[PDB]
């Protein structure tokens, strides 16, 4: 106990049931989903890395779970973030004017939660768990998200909005799941614009960020997909939220 086996935090506790619940509440409250059997969706889950070596997980370990999961997500009005999740689900939670991943019934079960298992044990592994940078890529969470974010980008079409931390060293970071998976699967063939929302994190006077190297980058690989890209300046995301809530504004 004064030396753990992986480098990661263990299993978030009473992880079961806490999946269990959150799965009973989003199907309560989200009629597309209310047919879903949360006992069938926590067996899924259970099922992708329970008995299995924690840095051996792979895509596949998931699909009973995806299915379980499939939901309809209206494909114009996605919000893919980067660095900024708290921006991002304040603003969704005003009106519903996009959705993000964390709106979706499997983003809403794994979100803040962490979870591992053991190979040839059935146990959950609540004292530690494999990193991602020290250990393994292929654990039960990072596998997770890979997963989920990659078939929530290719549900979008049409204008794709994404926000971005400003105040970052990379405004845009190519090692992101953002950057790494989610620009490389939307669909050409569907999506027309992927529109940046820069958040400014510089307080009040702060310079044009759409200008930023990185951003220049994310530009020419998006317009190489043959996607248009967008990008604007969000200055003070206070004002923002503030005229989302009450666009009957005058700052506004
Ligand atoms: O929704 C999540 C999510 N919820 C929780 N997490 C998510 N990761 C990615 N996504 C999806 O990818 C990006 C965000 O991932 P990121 O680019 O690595 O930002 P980031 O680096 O802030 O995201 C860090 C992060 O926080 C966990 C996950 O363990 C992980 O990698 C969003 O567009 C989402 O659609």
């Not at 086996?5 to 409250?29: D, Q």
């Not at 019934?105 to 020290?134: H, M, V």
Request: charged share 25%.
């Amino acid at each position: 106990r004064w030396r753990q086996t992986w480098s990661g935090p263990g299993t978030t506790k009473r992880f079961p049931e806490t999946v269990l619940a959150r799965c009973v509440k989003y199907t309560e409250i989200h009629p597309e989903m209310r047919h879903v059997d949360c006992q069938s969706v926590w067996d899924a889950f259970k099922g992708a890395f329970i008995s299995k070596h924690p840095c051996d997980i792979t895509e596949e370990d998931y699909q009973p779970l995806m299915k379980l999961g499939t939901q309809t997500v209206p494909c114009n009005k996605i919000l893919l973030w980067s660095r900024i999740k708290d921006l991002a689900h304040q603003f969704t939670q005003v009106q519903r004017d996009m959705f993000t991943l964390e709106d979706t019934l499997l983003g809403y079960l794994a979100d803040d939660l962490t979870w591992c298992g053991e190979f040839d044990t059935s146990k959950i592994n609540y004292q530690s768990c494999p990193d991602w940078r020290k250990d393994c890529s292929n654990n039960p969470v990072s596998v997770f998200w890979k997963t989920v974010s990659r078939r929530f980008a290719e549900a979008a079409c049409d204008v794709v909005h994404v926000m971005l931390d400003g105040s970052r060293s990379k405004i845009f970071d190519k090692d992101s799941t953002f950057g790494s998976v989610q620009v490389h699967n939307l669909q050409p063939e569907k999506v027309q614009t992927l529109e940046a929302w820069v958040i400014h994190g510089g307080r009040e006077d702060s310079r044009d960020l759409c200008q930023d190297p990185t951003i220049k980058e994310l530009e020419s690989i998006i317009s190489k997909r043959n996607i248009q890209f967008s990008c604007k300046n969000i200055y003070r995301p206070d004002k923002f939220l503030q005229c989302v809530k009450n666009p009957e504004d005058s700052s506004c």
